[PDB]
Each structure stands twice: as C-alpha cells, then as structure tokens.
Design a protein around this ligand. Structure first.
Ligand SMILES: [Zn+2]
Ligand SMILES: [Zn+2]
Ligand SMILES: [Zn+2]
Ligand SMILES: [Zn+2]
Lengths: 261, 614, 154, 355
C-alpha cells in the first residue's frame, strides 16, 4: 500500500547552463537531464506502487514533464525527451528576469500532489517527497512564497530534498531543515547521479537504518529592515512584525506610531 | 426428483423469472418457503408469510417457513382468499409457483369455512349452508355415534343438529379425516345469552405493536376466534390475556399450572382490568371462593381434572361451571394439554372461545397435530431476535461450557450402563469447580444467579457445599416465598438453587445469570421455556447486545453432550447461538473446592453411596 | 381564534374581520403536543384523571428532562391551584423534585401576590444570573394576566 | 377497538476574512473546559469529554501551527471549582500529554465560570497591554454556581480588556451571550462534531484588533543552534533550563540554544527566556503568520461550459471536467475545485501571481 511519489524539480535557468557550456566543463545540462530521467526510471523500477511526477522549472514558466529497454519506461523517457526539447526550442529570453520561478514550481508540485492524494485509493497510503536540484543563483523576492510553500509542505508532511551543484542557498538549507529533507552540495557534477542514488533515492524509513552523512548546520539570523544587517537581538513591530535595530517612535512599514509613555 | 448429492432437483418445476432482486421469496414445491431478511421488501413479505405460513427457522438472514393446511385455514379465518395470496406469492416468488403447491392450496381453501359448530343452550349444533356435505357426513358411523340421538336411540333431525358433548373430541379428529375442519366463529358482539361484565382496560395498559397485531389477527372481522398464540416469556403474555378477556367482556375462565400462576393472573387483572374484585374468584384447593357472581374465574387443570372424589363444595363449583355457559376460556402452557387428563377438561367445560397462550410448542411426544383440533391453528408467534432488536426482551448471551470428566468418574461412567449413570456425570468435581468460579465471578459482578438442577440430590449437595438456598420437591410454600423475597431484595442473597419446580410451578424473580447443570434428558421445550422465563429485559444494559447471561455446564464425552445438542435444537431454530468454551480464565488463580484429589475421591464415595435406589 | 363568536357576544357587527398571518424568515416557535408519557400513559387533565398518580409521575419525568435539556427559562401552567399543589406534594414525596431542583432552581407561586411578586423577582434574577429557574403557576393565576417574558425568560 | 380488522395486503404491492485590519499578533489564550455531569452525555460519539478533548488536541496543533508567538493555558472547571490543568506556555507536547491524561478524568459536579474567569484574570492581570488576552470557554451544562456577582467580574474583564468567546453545547445562555458580546468575543452553539471542528478552526484564526489594542516596539532575540563538538576544547555540556523545571534528571546536552542577552541555555524554541524575559524566536516562526497579513481572496467561479478557454488546470494540469472553474483575479488562471480549495485553505498564494 506504500504509494511513494518522487517529485523532481529542475533548475532550468538557461544562463547558468549557457555559462557552463562556455566553460566547456565535464558536466552539461544534457547530463543533468539524463541523470534525472535515470533516477525517475529507477524510482518507478523499485515498485509498481511507486509513482513519478517530474516538473521542469524554467525562467519563463514551469513545465510538467510528466530495443532492450522497458516499454513503459521507453515511452516515458521519449515523452520527457520530447518535453525538454519542446521547451528549449521555444525557450526565448524576453526580459531581464533571471531568478528561477522556484516558488511557483513548488506550488504546482504541491497542487499535483494534493490532486493525486485525493485520487489515492483509501486502502493505500501515499508517502510523497520532492527533490529539487539547484544550479543557478537563488531567488530573492520569492522568500515569502517560499516560506508559505515550506509551511504547507510541513502541514502535509512532505519531505523536500535540495541538491546543490554550484551555488549554495540558505533558503534551501532552512527548507530542508524544517521539512526534514536532505540537503547537500555535489562538487563533482558528473558524479552527481550517484549522490542522487546513494542518498536521495532511498526512502526515509530505509535511510533510518542506513548510515548517512551528518546534516549541515543551519543558521537563522535576522536582518534589520532599515539596513538588512544581521543582528542578535532586535526590536520587532507588534503590528506588521517589522524588525528595527534602533528604537523608533513610529513604524515605517505599517505607518504606526508606537504608543510608549 | 432426487439428485445424487441428496438435493431434490426442483429446477424443472420452478421456472425462474428475471425479477430476482425485487422478488425475495423462494417457493420450494416441498412446502418450504425461504425469505431473505436483507431484502428491502422483507417487512411486507414477513407479514404476508406470518399469516399464511408456519415458521420453521428464523436465523439472522435466511428464514424458512412451512405451509400446512392448518396455516391455510388460519389465513382463511383471518379473511384472505386464494387469488390474492397466489398473486402476492407470484409477485414475490423468484421462480414459477409449482402447480402441485397451487393445487394443494386450491384443495384446502375450498373445503375451509364449510362446517360450523355453534354452542347455544348447552347444545352443540353442526350447521352448513350445503346440506349435501351435511348429508354426506351422516354416513360416517363414528359421526352417527357422535351425533346426538333421542333417549329412544333415534337420531334427531339451514339445517343443523345437536351433538353429544362427550363425543366432541373424537368428532374433531374425524373432521380432519372428513377433510372438513370445524369453524370456530364466535358472536363477539351478537351474543345476547351471556350478559356482559363491567370489566375494562385501565389506562396504564399499553399494547406493544406485535401484541396488538396478534390480537387483531385473533379477532377476525371483529369476531373472537379460538386459536393458539405463542409469546416469549416476559413479553406481557398475562397482559395480552387480560386484554383479550376485557375485549370479549363475556364469561372468562383461565387455567394455570399452579396456584402461583393463578395469583399472578389475579394480580394482572387487578393491575390492568377494571373488573370488580368481588367478581374475581379462584377455584383453588386452599383459597376457595363461591362460584356465584364470579364473572371471571381462574383455576388449575388438576382441580378440574381431579377424577377422584373432590370436596362437596368442589362438586357445587363443577355443577355451576357446567350450568354456566362460557363465551371465553383461557388456557396457559398449551403444550401440557395433550395429556389425557387435561384433555378431558376440555370436554368437561362447555366454552365458546378457547384461546391458548404459551412460550413453546415443541412437544417431545409430537402430540401437536391433534392439538390443532383441540384448540385451533397457531395464530401468531413473534420473532425473538426482532424483539431483541426492538429492546422488548433482554438479548441473551448463551454459552456451553465443557467440563472434562474426572478419569475415575469417567471410568465409573463407562462402568455403569443404567439410569444410575446420571449421577456420575451430573456430579463432576471439575464441573463443581467451574460452577464455583462462575458464581464468584458473577457475585463480584453483582448479578442474580439462578442455578437450575433437575436432580434433587445433586442440587441439594451443590447448595449445601456452596452454602446457598435450595429448592426441591416439597418446598414448603412459606419458606419458598421467604427465600424468593430475600433473593429479590436482600443483597446478601443473590444465588438461588431451583429444582425442576422452577419451570411453571411458580414465578421466577427476574435474574441475569442462569446456570444449568442438570438436564431432564433432552427436554428441548421445557428447559428453553424455563430459560426464557428466567431472563427478562433489564434496564441499564439495554444498549449492550448482551444484557442477559446463560451458561450450560456440560460434561465432556458424556451422553450429556447429545442431550445438550438435541435441547439447543429449538433455540438454534430461534436464532440463538451457543459458543463453546472449554478453558475458564482465572480459575487457576482462585482457590476452589475439591482442589486436592482425595476431595474429589471423597465426593465420588458420597455419590456412589447414592446407589440406583436413590 | 374564532372570528365570529365576538360579534355574537358583543351583539354588534364589526365592519372588517381580518386575521393577520405571521410570516417568519426564521421559525422562532416550536409548538409541540405530548399526550403520550414515557410508559405510553394517556396524558389528560380531566378532573377524573387529575388525581392519577401515573400522570403525576409522567409530568415529573417530563419536567426533569426539560430542566436537564431546555435552557434556564421554564414556566409550567397547571389547570388549578389545588391540583398543582397536590402534584407538587406528590413529586416531593416521590423524590423526583429533588433532582429537578438540582437541575434548575424551583419557584412556585401562591395565593398572595406580594410573596408571588418576590418569587417572580427571584426567578427573573436567577435566570439573569445563569442558574436555571423553574416557575410553576396556574393558567388563571396572576402570571398569565400581566406578566411578560423576555426572550431568555420565555 | 382496533381489533375489529387489520390487513396489510396493499402494503404487499408492486413498486470569511475581514478587511485589511490589525489582528492579534501576540496571543495569550486560555481554554476553559467544563467538567460537570453533563460532560458524560453522548451528544458527540462516544461522549462529550472524549470528542471534546480530541478536538482540543487538534485545535492546539493547528493553533501552534498558525500562531507560533501565542500561549496556551488549560483550565478545567469541576465540582464548582477551577483547576489549572496546564501551565501557560507554547509547548504542544506538554499540552497534548495533559489532554491525554485528562481524557480519562472523572466528570462530576457543576461548572464554576466565576472562579475560572477569576483565575484567568489573575493570570492575565500582569500580561503586557500589547499582548492580546483571549479566553475560550467550553460550556456543557447550562447552569453554573458563582460565589459572587459575575457582572462585577464582567466589568473587571472589560476594564482589563480581555476577550472571551464561548461555544456552548446544548443551547444559548443569556448571561454567557452578554459576557461574550461585552468582552468583544463571539458566542456560538455546537450543531454537530463537524460544526464543532468548524468553530474551533474559525477560532484558531487571530481575532481582529480593537481600537484599544496597543502598538509597542517589542524587542526579541534570535539565537542560532549553538552545537559544541567534543573534539573542540570549547565544548561545554550543560543542562537545559526548561529541563531543570522537570522532576526527571535534565539531559546534559553538549550544545543547543543560548540566550544572546544572558547566555541562558534552552533546548526548545520558540520560548521566551526565563531569566531576562527576552523572547527567543526564529525567523520562520515570525514568517509563519505572514499569510494572515495577506489573505488569499476567493477566486471567480465560472462553470466550464461558460468558460471558453483552456481545459487543463493551471495548478495540477488535470483536465477540467468539473462543473465549476475557479479563475484568479490577478493572473486569471484555471484551477479545478481541489486546487482552488487547497490554495485558499493552505497555500494562500496563487501560482500565476508568483509568476
Ligand atoms: Zn509595523
Ligand atoms: Zn536571557
Ligand atoms: Zn488542479
Ligand atoms: Zn493568481
């Protein structure tokens, strides 16, 4: 009855992969896509009850991806190969927006998980996990929506694993900490697939008996809005929850004067 | 036709129609009918089958009823014709109705309602609108002897004729042989000979839906009709009798097994009927009242059946009864009637309407077919499980507890082949320990414990060893009543040993735990009746499915096993289940009697001292 | 209720005789008739049946259930003072009245208006103080004449 | 006289957000639970006590999930007395344990609302004005015993600006109605277990702040999870201050959370520091209530036949076969019923709006 859904989110920023191609490094985006497809094939391979949901997170929007080879696996891969080429051929950069729409893809994934869970037979239980791979820089404005996604996932108890390639993002660290997911940076991108298999592929119950790398320490410092500087103790607004390092009689954000005698 | 598997191949004679789910009835050509209780049309089919068919098995799901000529005559007396019944069967039978079944109904229905017997001026007249059948009946020599003739030997002449009272019962058997059953129709409202009685129903009396339904079945077309009604013990049977007597309002006679039942009936009439106490008299050997002005009389079979010389006052009472014309008579525990002495009472008493009320009808002597003409067809019999669900009766929790025989007892059990063998298995020390443990458990549970033991010696031994009250043969009435009233109220007394007298000789105070140790030998009706009488609905445990507790201690590998199985046949037919329990948890922790071997050896000595003479 | 009896009683002809039906967006009234007791005893108030102890006990059980269920405001109108006093005495002897008092406080009027007024004031104060108060009056007493009930009183 | 005739032959025949208004950012909630004889009633299966306490555990879970900066106190009024079942704190585990222990209690006596309200007022007397004072009362029985006038206590609560909301079980009580209306709280009545859950969920959400609500600049600290390694010479195991409060021997933990103001060591967060009174919080805890600041408005409902557009949901790519389609106000996307429900109830954000 173990219905395990493995959600895959891909950092499809064209800028980072274009630069990497300019670097002519050992690892390319095609290798990342192949590794993702292999991981999904193995996930469906482990058990029939296991299901796969793959969504591509591109700057323009989020795309739902899904001869000696398994027929259903062959069809799924050719579908995915069709989807990625379809996106890339139509991938036109029109605008100065560079940050990946990380939050929106997560919201779409959560909605799909909810839809499938409603469709789950009541005789069976659906464990769901989301795997996200990080390549380009993190997004700044999506912080509120990212926190909302984290809160919703923790409410529905969905593990979220973040995989770092080049750029570390403390947001992903905190997300994995709160959600209980696994966070790790892979230095050898070509070896990356094994890190997915050795760590991300096993289920959390399986990971319990298995010996795992220790979790990375995560900080939760706060930046005071008037200068965005990290502090230890700060003054919090009782109205709009704004943080101020210096005592103020009037709040800047909610425009409320502090009634202190 | 019979298949090789023993099933009778009825496929050829039962043409199935596609209305499967809608039609819930199966009509086998053997006369048996099957109904599915889970069908949405169960209630209507149940009510229809009650009037037309005699129940056989009423388990949870699939009920089996039977068709008899008596059932058909009862349905006709209700007022249902052949065409409507056949149409309803067809609308409910899953397959085609067999023609032989149809022919059987056709044969029975036509002959019904032909011969009528009327009692007027202490004279019994047989009348019919068809003198051809009447003239045909004159041919029978038995009828010729039964038909009243002049003192000169000459037979007397809408044409009817008087009939000898003492020859009525033999004529009744002849009517079945003549295939013309008597019609017991009473002028409920048209009576003028017998004056009414100022007796009514007090407002405290409430008729439950099944009670009112049974009464309405009895009173066909507003006219009282003699018959037999089966009511479970504790379902207000006495209330139903009082209600029927108040309804008829004519001269009412009731017969009970013992004077205790007489007192119960008198209290019931005082509790519900509006008749004056002065008009109520008991024809008992101890409490005597003049028959004059006795609007309603309560008596016993032995008093009326006392063939030996009675008291001179009893002679006057009998003369008054014979002179008195009884519009209504009430009989209790109808299963006792088939006895010759009690049957003679029916001839003795001249009564128009005779209604019998009882809890069971399975006589081990199968003397019930003739009983159909002694009184009439069975009018009604409620579903016990249905009353359990409705909460009218306590839902009994039934257990069969297997007690292994002691090998020394078992060796002696094999040794004896005679009637003395009863004491061997009825005095099992392991059974004694199990009984002691159960008594401790229920006393800690604070329940009323009734120990039923047919053997007098076994009952006295158990009661003395356990230091509990015992009831046996003589049982002086004052001491009996004292012990009963102590049991009802005194919390110190909650364990009463009652011998065979507890069945019908007196009323049993309501209890919850009934432990049966000794058996009559297969009295499937007597012990079931006593069980139903013991256990009644109890407030507080209404929600729970097990508010009444019954346990039967059976000696393993003995002839008691076969007796228990034969006995529970009727209760299983009533849908009651019995769970077999061998191991009693908690006995090892508790210390009980005969813990050591020689104690059981001493008990064996005591029992063997009681040889075949005892 | 009868629109024609009054012209006969007062010996005159009103020009207009119209009854204004009440339209409710919310059904604020639940008139119910209970003539069957717990034991299915026929409930009646005829003087022949007023002395029945069974009806007294049925009324006591109904009152106890109402106090245990219905909110604080309870008023019960009997048919006569003597019958009400006899029923109250019977309930006190039966012991049911103690449970009723435990559920909600009990107040019974008497002949004198002055003490009756104090009893009514105590009843209203108890209702306003959150403790269930039960009033027992007669249909022809002063309560039915000039005493009005607030929503939490009626 | 019904015995004349009876036949059943014919029966055998063929056949809710408010506006952009200030709310209760800081909450001091006290829950009042009745313990009278009426709690044994089976209005909610199996009885009032068990269902009420299970719903209370669920309510505490949701309340701490949505209000990290709130506090919970549990009071049981039994036998005309008031007993503080649980101390005022933010720990969900202790509250759940206390409720589980109270599941097997004995319900007897009568409620004493006066004493319970007096205890709550005394407890919340010293709380700061900016923090909201909220009281929830579960009233099973319709009657209570009060040693003194309750209207004086009502005046005291009004002067102390304490909000009290009551959810009765049988019917409405006039005194409780007046109390809730004057204190600014809301009075409700249980219809069934589902309605009980609905009312509890509604009361989870912060209440709107009245005009009298203060606006003060409160100072809070945000320590990290200082973990010491035994290989380092600077590893100082120390017992937790919260763990010292208990009877069991505190666990000597190598590291943890240390107060930036007085170096007080705590293993549980977010908990205000006991020594200096500083409230030690974390950034997600503050952000956990941000959705209340920007509620998600209801989307426009247009049936599929009336919508001439995409037949795939924007949220789950599911083919739109439902009778109703929910279109956003901002980005005007297409969402099915399930996605619309989940977004409004939990996500509180529109995917296209993020885009
Ligand atoms: Zn502010
Ligand atoms: Zn500190
Ligand atoms: Zn959707
Ligand atoms: Zn939108």
């Amino acid at each position: 009855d173990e219905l395990n859904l493995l959600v895959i989110v891909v950092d499809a920023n064209p800028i980072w992969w274009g630069k990497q191609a300019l670097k002519e490094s050992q690892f390319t985006l095609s290798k990342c896509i192949d590794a993702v497809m292999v991981l999904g094939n193995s996930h469906l391979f482990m058990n029939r009850s296991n299901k796969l949901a793959v969504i591509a997170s591109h700057i323009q929007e989020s795309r739902f991806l899904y001869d000696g080879k398994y027929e259903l696996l062959t069809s799924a891969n050719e579908v995915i190969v069709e989807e990625i080429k379809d996106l890339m051929t139509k991938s036109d950069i029109k605008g100065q927006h560079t940050e990946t729409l990380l939050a929106g893809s997560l919201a779409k994934a959560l909605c799909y998980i909810h839809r499938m869970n409603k469709e789950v037979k009541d005789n069976q239980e659906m464990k769901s996990r989301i795997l996200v791979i990080k390549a380009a820089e993190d997004s700044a404005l999506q912080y509120m929506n990212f926190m909302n996604v984290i809160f919703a996932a923790q409410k529905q108890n969905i593990l979220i694993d973040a995989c770092v390639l080049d750029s570390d993002s403390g947001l992903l660290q905190q997300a994995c900490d709160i959600t209980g997911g696994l966070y790790l940076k892979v230095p050898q991108m070509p070896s990356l697939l094994q890190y997915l298999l050795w760590v991300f592929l096993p289920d959390q119950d399986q990971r319990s008996q298995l010996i795992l790398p220790p979790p990375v320490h995560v900080d939760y410092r706060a930046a005071c809005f008037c200068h965005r500087n990290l502090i230890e103790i700060g003054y919090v607004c009782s109205v709009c929850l704004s943080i101020f390092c210096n005592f103020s009689p009037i709040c800047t954000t909610c425009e409320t004067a502090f009634k202190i005698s | 036709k019979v298949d090789e598997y023993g099933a009778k191949d009825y496929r050829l004679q039962m043409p199935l129609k596609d209305d499967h789910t809608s039609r819930p009835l199966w009509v086998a050509p053997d006369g048996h009918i099957f109904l599915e209780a889970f069908s949405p049309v169960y209630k209507y089919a149940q009510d229809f089958l009650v009037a037309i068919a005699e129940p056989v098995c009423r388990p949870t799901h699939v009920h089996e009823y039977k068709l008899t000529a008596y059932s058909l005559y009862a349905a006709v007396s209700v007022g249902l014709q052949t065409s409507d019944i056949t149409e309803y069967l067809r609308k409910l039978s899953k397959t085609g109705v067999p023609d032989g079944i149809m022919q059987f109904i056709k044969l029975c229905t036509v002959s019904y309602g032909k011969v009528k017997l009327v009692l007027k001026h202490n004279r019994y007249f047989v009348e019919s609108c068809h003198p051809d059948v009447i003239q045909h009946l004159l041919q029978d020599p038995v009828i010729r002897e039964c038909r009243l003739r002049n003192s000169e030997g000459e037979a007397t002449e809408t044409v009817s004729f008087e009939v000898k009272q003492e020859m009525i019962e033999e004529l009744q058997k002849r009517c079945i042989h003549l295939e013309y059953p008597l019609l017991a129709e009473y002028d409920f409202r048209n009576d003028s000979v017998n004056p009414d009685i100022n007796i009514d129903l007090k407002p405290t009396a409430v008729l439950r839906p099944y009670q009112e339904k049974s009464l309405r079945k009895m009173f066909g077309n507003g006219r009282a009709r003699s018959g037999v009604i089966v009511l479970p013990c504790g379902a207000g049977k006495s209330l139903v009798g009082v209600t029927a007597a108040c309804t008829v309002r004519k001269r009412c006679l009731v017969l009970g097994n013992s004077a205790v039942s007489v007192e119960q009936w008198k209290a019931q009439f005082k509790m519900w009927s509006t008749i004056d106490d002065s008009q109520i008299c008991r024809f008992t050997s101890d409490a005597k009242d003049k028959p004059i002005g006795c609007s309603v009389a309560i008596s016993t079979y032995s008093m009326l059946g006392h063939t030996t010389k009675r008291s001179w006052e009893a002679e006057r009472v009998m003369e008054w009864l014979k002179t008195q014309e009884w519009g209504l008579m009430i009989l209790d525990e109808v299963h006792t009637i088939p006895a010759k002495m009690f049957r003679r009472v029916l001839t003795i008493v001249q009564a128009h309407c005779k209604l019998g009320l009882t809890a069971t009808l399975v006589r081990e002597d199968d003397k019930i077919v003739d009983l159909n003409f002694l009184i009439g067809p069975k009018l009604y019999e409620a579903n016990w499980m249905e009353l359990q669900n409705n909460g009218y009766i306590a839902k009994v929790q039934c257990a069969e507890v297997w007690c292994p025989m002691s090998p020394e007892f078992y060796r002696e059990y094999v040794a004896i082949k005679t009637k003395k063998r009863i004491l061997l298995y009825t005095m099992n020390p392991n059974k004694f320990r199990a009984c002691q443990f159960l008594i401790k458990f229920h006393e800690r549970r604070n329940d009323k414990i009734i120990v039923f033991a047919d053997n007098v010696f076994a009952l006295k031994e158990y009661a003395i060893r356990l230091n509990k009250p015992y009831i046996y043969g003589p049982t002086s009435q004052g001491e009996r009543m004292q012990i009963l009233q102590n049991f009802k109220h005194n919390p110190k007394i909650n364990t009463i040993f009652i011998s065979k007298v507890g069945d019908t000789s007196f009323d049993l105070p309501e209890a919850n735990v009934l432990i049966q140790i000794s058996s009559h030998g297969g009295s499937r009706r007597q012990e079931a009746q006593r069980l139903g009488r013991v256990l009644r609905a109890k407030k507080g445990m209404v929600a729970e499915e097990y508010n009444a507790f019954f346990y039967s201690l059976v000696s393993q590998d003995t002839q008691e096993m076969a007796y228990s199985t034969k006995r529970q046949r009727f209760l299983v037919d009533q849908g009651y289940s019995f769970k077999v329990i061998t191991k009693l948890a908690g006995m090892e922790e508790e210390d009980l009697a005969f813990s050591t071997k020689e104690e059981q050896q001493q008990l064996l000595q005591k029992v063997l001292a009681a040889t075949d003479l005892d | 209720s009868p629109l024609d009896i009054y012209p006969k009683i007062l010996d005159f002809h009103p020009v207009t005789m119209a009854t204004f039906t009440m339209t409710l967006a919310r059904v604020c009234l639940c008139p119910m008739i209970i003539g069957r007791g717990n034991d299915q005893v026929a409930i009646s108030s005829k003087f022949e049946t007023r002395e029945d102890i069974a009806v007294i006990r049925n009324y006591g059980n109904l009152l106890l259930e109402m106090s245990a269920v219905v909110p604080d405001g309870i008023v019960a109108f009997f048919t006569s003072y003597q019958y009400m006093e006899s029923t109250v005495a019977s309930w006190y002897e039966q012991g049911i009245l103690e449970n009723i008092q435990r559920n909600k406080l009990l107040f019974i009027e008497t002949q004198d208006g002055a003490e009756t007024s104090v009893a009514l004031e105590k009843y209203q104060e108890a209702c306003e103080n959150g403790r269930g108060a039960i009033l027992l009056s007669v249909a022809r007493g002063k309560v039915s004449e000039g005493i009005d009930f607030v929503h939490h009183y009626g | 006289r019904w015995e004349g005739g009876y036949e059943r032959t014919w029966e055998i025949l063929k056949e809710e957000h408010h506006g952009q208004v200030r709310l209760g950012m800081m909450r001091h909630l006290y829950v009042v639970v009745d313990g009278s004889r009426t709690m044994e009633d089976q209005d909610l299966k199996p009885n009032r006590l068990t269902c009420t306490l299970k719903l209370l555990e669920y309510f505490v879970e949701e309340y701490f999930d949505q209000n990290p900066i709130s506090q919970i106190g549990i009071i049981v009024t039994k036998s005309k007395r008031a007993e503080k079942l649980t101390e005022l704190s933010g720990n969900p585990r202790k509250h759940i344990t206390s409720l589980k222990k109270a599941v097997d209690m004995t319900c007897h006596g009568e409620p004493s609302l006066y004493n319970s309200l007096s205890i709550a007022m005394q407890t919340l007397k010293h709380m700061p004005g900016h923090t909201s004072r909220e009281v929830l009362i579960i009233f099973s029985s319709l009657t209570t015993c009060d040693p003194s006038n309750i209207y004086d206590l009502i005046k005291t609560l009004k002067a102390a600006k304490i909000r009290v909301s009551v959810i009765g079980l049988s019917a409405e009580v006039r005194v409780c109605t007046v109390l809730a209306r004057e204190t600014g709280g809301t009075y409700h009545v249980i219809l069934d277990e589902s309605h009980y859950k609905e009312l509890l969920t509604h009361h989870v959400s912060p209440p709107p702040a009245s005009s009298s609500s203060e606006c003060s600049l409160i100072r809070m600290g945000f320590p990290q999870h200082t973990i010491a390694s035994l290989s380092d010479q600077d590893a100082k195991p120390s017992f937790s201050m919260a763990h010292l409060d208990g009877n069991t021997e505190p666990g000597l933990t190598l590291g943890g959370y240390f107060c930036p103001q007085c170096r007080a060591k705590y293993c549980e967060l977010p908990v205000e520091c006991k020594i200096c009174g500083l409230t030690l919080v974390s950034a997600p805890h503050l952000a956990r209530s941000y959705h209340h600041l920007f509620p998600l408005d209801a989307f426009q409902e247009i049936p599929l036949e009336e919508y001439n557009g995409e037949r795939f949901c924007y949220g789950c790519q599911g083919e739109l076969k439902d009778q109703h389609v929910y279109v956003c106000a901002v980005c005007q996307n297409v969402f099915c019923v399930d996605c619309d429900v989940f977004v409004h109830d939990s996500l509180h954000c529109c995917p296209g709006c993020i885009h």
